[PDB]
Design a protein around this ligand. Sequence first.
Ligand SMILES: *C[C@@H](C)C(=O)n1cc(C=O)c2c(-c3ccc(N4CCN(C)CC4)cc3)cccc21
Ligand SMILES: [Mg+2]
Ligand SMILES: [Mg+2]
Ligand SMILES: [Zn+2]
Length: 199
Amino acid sequence: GSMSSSVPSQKTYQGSYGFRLGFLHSGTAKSVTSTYSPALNKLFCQLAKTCPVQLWVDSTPPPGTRVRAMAIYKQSQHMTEVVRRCPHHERSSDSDGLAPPQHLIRVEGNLRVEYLDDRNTFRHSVVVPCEPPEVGSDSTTIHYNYMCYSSCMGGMNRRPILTIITLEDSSGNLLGRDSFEVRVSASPGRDRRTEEENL
Ligand SMILES: *C[C@@H](C)C(=O)n1cc(C=O)c2c(-c3ccc(N4CCN(C)CC4)cc3)cccc21
Ligand SMILES: [Mg+2]
Ligand SMILES: [Mg+2]
Ligand SMILES: [Zn+2]
């Protein structure tokens, strides 16, 4: 589809503030809508359901810090192809009004969400202000939504993707980076259990 002339770095970088991702320990029951496999570093989730991702730091980042999410294809031969929604779902107009219909990754429950189509790389990303934990809480959670199945033909087309989360300062400079593989399917609990059986 759309071809980029670069590939974003995937290098894990904790940085000065000790940035890393956390996930709920949800298990693999049929009722789960998302579940994270530490052994695979892979999130399994359902189409358009909340995926809570925790942002952990050892120190408070400076004011105006933001958190960006971006998807890339995992396999080398696909990495320069921009990850985007399939034609069916793009023309489906199931947007909450804020998200571009071509974007795979949305953030829910945040009215300060900002979406970027990069003018040079053509990649899509979604960025929100990074907030410290709420009173009583230990971490900051962001609720992501994946708006296509991994099997959507004409979009991901059964190709595995990586989601890259970056902490950036107000000017856009990199403060930290982490990532995880994603599979979007109708049965994440079963898919995780099955893929873990095959290690
Ligand atoms: C923008 C976002 C990354 C942020 O500002 N942020 C995230 C977190 C935590 O996830 C933040 C804290 C924070 C960090 C750690 C703790 N705990 C207390 C006890 N636990 C077990 C270990 C450390 C609490 C709060 C603070 C400020 C920002 C922040
Ligand atoms: Mg990790
Ligand atoms: Mg090729
Ligand atoms: Zn789709």
